[PDB]
Amino acid sequence: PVARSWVCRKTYVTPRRPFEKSRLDQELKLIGEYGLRNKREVWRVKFTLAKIRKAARELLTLDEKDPRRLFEGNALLRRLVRIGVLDEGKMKLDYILGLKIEDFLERRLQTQVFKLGLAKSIHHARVLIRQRHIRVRKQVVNIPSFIVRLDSQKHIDFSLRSPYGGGRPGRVKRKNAKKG
Template sequence: MGDPKRLTSKYSGPRHPWIKTRIEEEKKLTAEYGLKNKKEIYKATSKLKKYADQAKKLIAATGKQSELEKTQLINKLNRLGLVSKTAQLDDVLSLTVRDLLDRRLQTILHKKGYARTTKQARQFITHGHIIINNKPLTIPSYLVTLAEEPSIQFIEKSSLISTEHPERKFEKIKTAEKPEKKPTRKKKRKKKNKKQDKK
């Protein structure tokens, strides 16, 4: 037997873990996108950094090979819905974590109205209720391409396929009627004064 393969981490955490503004932003992202933990943010950040590093190298490079790699990078990000077909490498550098999180299967499922919340969308995916191109997918962090997006649906055997399923019904929030404001002491005094004047 050879030496065991050393597993390398797919992401790198923050250099300064105790920065208040970053911690608050991570909390917002975790709640908004229904993330399991902050590792999912770090993975997205690391993926963006790879794209940015590649773009920086290509900006500095010249020649046919660099032009080919530039086209390949733009096309790849365009398929994921992150940039347009006519995008430049500078557009790659301006991508944010939110841009990447918006392309997650979990987020798209919620935006399409298949789930009431992003957390519920995560549950539907992990429990095997969702298919893409007729293939079941149980990975909430899967980045959906523009071509795949229209094929997202519930598996036929799933009870959630019915829009009448209680888990898919959106409750209408009733707005409470505002109570009538009671007249203040000043208003009461004015009314009394008016009555006295009439007399």
């Protein structure tokens, strides 16, 4: 008898056919475009889109005025318009199934630091986030997989304690600015 919780789940599904060249080709293209580190970072986004599509694929076989459909479809489409991968007009449940896997990779903080002009390449954006430079409305974020919903997409700035922000430049320059 302990005061604990053992509740955990895995968040990726390893593919069945391991060496199919088309699967290796498309996921390596996603790794090289979006600045992911390994294929588990692709499979995790495939798992969250698969869970979303399984929820919509479960709701779509109901009569359209059953109240579970009318409540949970509105909640699921509201979360997808809130994170920004489904646009504001087309909130219908048939438009969940037209989500491509590149929607959730565009809303990561690494891709939204590269697309908002705060880095010179996407790999510079991930190494800028991981070195505690990027903050989102006065919370310093060290997670490159932070999915920026669009009431936080507006506030993306450099840190107040960073050399490319406010001041106090790092140990390389201040050892370098001691010459004598």
